[PDB]
Amino acid sequence: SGFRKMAFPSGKVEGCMVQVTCGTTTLNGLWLDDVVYCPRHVICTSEDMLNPNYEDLLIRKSNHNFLVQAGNVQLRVIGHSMQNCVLKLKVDTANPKTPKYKFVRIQPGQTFSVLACYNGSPSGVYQCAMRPNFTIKGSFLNGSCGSVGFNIDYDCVSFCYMHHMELPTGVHAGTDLEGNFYGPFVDRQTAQAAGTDTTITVNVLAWLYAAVINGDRWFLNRFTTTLNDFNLVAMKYNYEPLTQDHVDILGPLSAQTGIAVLDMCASLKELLQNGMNGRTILGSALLEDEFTPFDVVRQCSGVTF
Amino acid sequence: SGFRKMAFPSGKVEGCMVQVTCGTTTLNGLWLDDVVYCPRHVINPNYEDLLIRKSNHNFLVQAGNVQLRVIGHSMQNCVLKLKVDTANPKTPKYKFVRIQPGQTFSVLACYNGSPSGVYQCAMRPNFTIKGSFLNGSCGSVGFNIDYDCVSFCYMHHMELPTGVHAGTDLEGNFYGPFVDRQTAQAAGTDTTITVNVLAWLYAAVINGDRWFLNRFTTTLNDFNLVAMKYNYEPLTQDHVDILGPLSAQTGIAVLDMCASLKELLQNGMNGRTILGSALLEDEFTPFDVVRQCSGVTF
Ligand SMILES: CNC(=O)CN1Cc2ccc(Cl)cc2[C@@]2(CCN(c3cncc4ccccc34)C2=O)C1
Ligand SMILES: CNC(=O)CN1Cc2ccc(Cl)cc2[C@@]2(CCN(c3cncc4ccccc34)C2=O)C1
Ligand SMILES: [Cl-]
Structure with missing residues (x-):
């Protein structure tokens, strides 16, 4: 547990x-x-950056x-x-x-571990997600450039991120290991700003399935929804559109708990409307979006409580 | 940032x-x-x-x-x-150290002698840890690093009925009134680690989040009378001394920050967040805040 x-x-x-x-x-x-x-x-010098x-x-x-x-x-x-x-x-x-390693380019919504380093020496490790606006909410100080993001599924390290810069809002931008940036960013000091960020809907749903697996159902309701009606409501709360791919990906968690994806979507709609009313879900008062369906399956028990 | x-x-x-x-x-x-x-x-x-x-x-x-x-x-x-x-x-290079409640450490979760993940957590005032452990995780260890020396502080033994975890130091002494056997055991009523919440309020100010600051101050006694009513651990003079460096870096006295915590407890956050959280976070010690906001390496 x-x-x-x-x-x-x-x-x-x-x-x-x-x-x-x-x-x-x-x-x-x-x-x-x-x-x-x-x-x-x-x-580059600091002057060269312009x-x-x-x-x-x-x-x-x-x-x-x-x-x-x-x-x-x-x-x-x-x-x-x-x-x-x-x-x-x-x-x-x-x-x-x-x-044993691979270089992989990730998509927004995907999570990875970051090994934060200064002067070639590692100082800490944390987990984070590639935001829909292609930035990461990391913890990086000056000297952290070149720190990397990765996943280690099995004995193979999949390098997916290299840190390059911090944007004016305090968020971070970088490249895959082939040097291609995530997002419309350039390694130039110009007027660059993170786009409006949104919540990773498929990840929030996965985390709601994780709450059900660990024994919590207070947020469920007797309603269902269509995919279109859920997206019309979700976009009003700055939530990413949920696609048929996302519904397919949530299939295993839907079968393990016995709750259809569009029934979990109806609980999410109601949580967005009502808030939590002094209650928490997995020790959090906010809806968590930095756990993918794959992360929930990896961490949680195969047996629902 | x-x-x-x-x-x-x-x-x-x-x-x-x-x-x-x-x-x-x-x-x-x-x-x-x-x-x-x-x-x-x-x-x-x-x-x-x-x-x-x-x-x-x-x-x-x-x-x-x-x-x-x-x-x-x-x-x-x-x-x-x-x-x-x-x-x-x-x-x-290593040491076996016994930690006190409120202190944090990293846990390397393992199954079948193979590490699967790493997370950070704190020794709660009731001597339990809110970890993430499945059957087979027993023997997983908690540790800190200070320079090039690993200080082993925890070994996982069991899960309590509420889903929290109990274990020993590396000399086999349990943290808390727990025993290694199947019997009726329960986690005691937990409290919030006050010195850690204050340290995290200082980290928010360092990261440019100051909406919770006010013009007021408080005495240590008056703050403790209020804190005891919200199941917060008492704040001692040692805690105030330990917060000194963060108080000097931000220009906010510890009793000045205590007055902000008192107002957050009595009135809530009112739809606002601090460092992306709607709850007051207590699993970062004053030293953790200093290390993360300074880039200390290993
Ligand atoms: C915050 N940025 C600046 O003050 C100027 N920065 C322009 C700039 C422009 C393009 C590129 Cl590809 C790099 C860069 C710098 C290189 C280092 N760097 C940083 C990276 N991570 C975290 C940081 C935290 C604090 C201060 C700097 C940080 C940058 O963004 C420098
Ligand atoms: C929840 N515990 C039980 O059902 C029985 N448990 C009796 C028991 C009695 C004394 C001791 Cl020192 C250990 C133990 C067990 C050994 C393994 N273990 C566990 C540890 N971590 C996480 C777990 C997650 C799920 C299930 C078991 C977990 C225990 O508490 C087992
Ligand atoms: Cl991906």
């Missing part, structure tokens, strides 16, 4: 974190085999301009190239602690 | 987790040097009588896909110590 925001064990990722320095800029890199991956803005020409800044660099530190050992850079917004530094030593 | 429930990086602890099997019971063990530590319930129980009937080969210890050979066994309080023939090459 119990329901916690759980992160993946970070050990496989800790063994990959290095410090990358180029001139006066210092950030984190990910050392996998003989390549160190890091944000390309490591080659309108950086990365190709022009990079062509003036040689291998020995990049200082890579793994623990207390200096790695030798023997090559460098740019792939989108990530810089790839070829080093002379392959990481002996390289885990 | 941002404020998250952050756990310590679990890597140093992952390299210590093993699977321990005795007959039909399977749980997790902590392999440090040549000793594996695990709950003694792996064996109305008379533990000395159950233990005397077991030989070394009755305990099956698995580290990854390698079988460790048990060469000795002894009991220390509610913890079984299995001497193995191989020292853990991944043993970190």
